[model samples]
Target: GSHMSNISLIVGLGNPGSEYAQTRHNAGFWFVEQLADKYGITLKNDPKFHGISGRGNIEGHDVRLLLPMTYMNRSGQSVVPFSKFYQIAPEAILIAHDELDMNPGVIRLKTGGGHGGHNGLRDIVPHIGPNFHRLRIGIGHPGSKERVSGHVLGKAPSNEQSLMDGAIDHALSKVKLLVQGQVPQAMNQINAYKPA
Candidate 1:
């Protein structure tokens, strides 16, 4: 059996529940929500994906949006099944996730990179085979080694909160362009957008 489809799956990585909401680690989920709002699509709970999902059109291409309920480290559990069932190729999938390597308000897109200690990416690489698109949302690094976990799981300070918000909005715009197969244009547009 072969898996092929025009449908693109955009998976947003995050832990489930209110306690984790608004945290730096869940920035992916925030981007998904923004996309939903822009498209006026609703993401409903889907038992099969163990997450909320919705289908919509982006640049005339049908797209499936997913937010896994399985939590960060176990992201692939939802991604693999959903891709297989929907016949979506790894290349057609894009993951929006937090990146500690970049500073807050920065966004980068790439394919087939090392996980760089991100458990979510670690789990995803094995299942999707690592050639899928990644929309890396910079959350900045922890101040100290011992504070790593808390830094990701905790809310950004009041001043920095706006930076994360801007990053999400910027990322959402870039994904829109990417869906249109305008990667270079998207990169230029997003890279030039300064956060106020």
Candidate 2:
């Protein structure tokens, strides 16, 4: 019941403020930044929606990019109002965020799944249904529960950095198919990167 043939809104999950800069949790922000760089789209502060937003043509799709100014736990509050005002369906949304189950270099794209204990996704579900797409950028696990909070909050090691950078690059390369709503094709292209 919740699926979209085309996406009109992409909300990259992250916290605002300099404290979160470049942390693993900000991978979604990085994805949005990549889009900005590619299309020269300027994301401006929009306090009405509690986020920074950009609207433009991505490949052949007219898409809106959003980065919530609220902390990760309140991301949905930033997204809900704007989506409702713009009439963006729950299924027409894509959220890019970090995934803990994967190693630092894995980039995955999927639709309609559980949050897997992500605080960002946890907050988003109530505002938008759990039927949206997720661009799961891997941040790798800490091998122990006690380390996860710290790991996500800190800078990654150089080796992990190389992996994540490669993953981001790979994902960015496949953006056109995503914007064109070719999920299967985009999945094929994005999931094809086998680490070296």
Candidate 3:
């Protein structure tokens, strides 16, 4: 089944800084950048949006890409205002972020779910509810609650990084389906991918 509305905005959640650049938590940021590159969009810093954002065409559909400069925990501080200003509905948005529950190389697309304790999602829900679609990029857990913060904010092992890369690339290949609101097809293609 096709979605009622195509995704107009795609937001990637992560802190902004060189130190956090390669962290597992920035996988979302990486996803958006890849999408922007594929679409030939140039993301620029804008104070009005409090983030780096740009617009371009994806499969002939007008789309906006955003990487909130706000820290991961306060992503809504940037996302909410920008989306409102653009008059983009919650359902017409997709927020990508790291998922500790799944292992590296696995990604999934879904709509309307709880934050699952993710700082970014938790913050965003208060600003716009949870009706938006989500691109969950797996980053594997560290097996202990006390190590989670460090795990997500730290760089992944080389092998794991390669797996994550594979997953992101796979997701990128199916992004046009998302731009066209073919959620089921996008999910089928993305969710079934596994890195060797």
Query: Top TM-score: which candidate number?
Result: 3
Colliding pairs, model 3 = none
Residues 1-196 of candidate 3 have per-residue lDDT tens digits of 1135698899999999999999999999999999999889999987887899999889998888899998998889999999888888888899999999998988999899899889999989988999999999999999699999999999999999999999999999988888898888887888889786
The prediction achieving the highest lDDT against the true structure is 3
Give the least accurate 10-residue stretch of model 1, judged by summed lDDT. Answer: 1-10
Candidate 2 segments whose C-alpha is farther than 4 A from its true place: 1-4
RMSD of 3: 2.2
Descending-lDDT candidate ranking: 3, 2, 1
Full-model lDDT for every candidate: 0.80, 0.84, 0.90
For each candidate in turn, the TM-score is: 0.91, 0.94, 0.96
Model 1: residues with Cα > 4 Å off, grouped in runs: 1-7
Sum up the clashes in candidate 2: 0
- List CA RMSD, all candidates: 2.4, 2.1, 2.2
